[PDB]
Design a protein around this ligand. Structure first.
Ligand SMILES: C[C@@H]1CC(=O)Nc2cc3cc(c2N1)/C=C/CCCN1CCCc2ccc(cc21)OCCNC3=O
Length: 115
């Protein structure tokens, strides 16, 4: 099966918007990690490939996903980085877990519709 970029954008954008609309839980994830500004300069000793909502938005808007699972992989990358770098007791970790629950509710029916 072939997916045109505008079909992916149409189908997937509501699931990305649902993540943005979690307030305050999306706030750690709305911008690319800047380790010096955030006071976490060792970040890229732990995480290699950063991901955030603004980068996913741009990739969706510019046709950078061939297949819907490439979009899922980037959201999962964003979550994995946060669950790796931050302690289980931390705000960022807990906010990530909230977003992950919302993401399932959004993406699971879409992925099944898209086949
Ligand atoms: C996903 C990304 C990277 C990560 O995996 N862990 C984080 C750690 C800190 C901060 C963030 C993280 N998210 C991003 C946070 C939200 C920014 C909210 N704002 C709003 C403006 C004022 C302010 C001041 C200090 C601050 C956050 C802060 O936090 C200092 C130490 N930062 C983290 O510990």
């Amino acid at each position: 099966k072939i997916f045109k970029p505008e079909e992916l954008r149409q189908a997937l954008m509501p699931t990305l918007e649902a993540l943005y609309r979690q307030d305050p839980e999306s706030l750690p994830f709305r911008q690319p990690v800047d380790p010096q500004l955030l006071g976490i300069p060792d970040y890229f000793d732990i995480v290699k490939n950063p991901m955030d909502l603004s980068t996913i938005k741009r990739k969706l808007d510019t046709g950078q996903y061939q297949e819907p699972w490439q979009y899922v992989d980037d959201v999962w990358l964003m979550f994995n980085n946060a669950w790796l770098y931050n302690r289980k007791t931390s705000r960022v970790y807990k906010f990530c877990s909230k977003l992950a629950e919302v993401f399932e509710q959004e993406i699971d029916p879409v992925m099944q519709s898209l086949g």
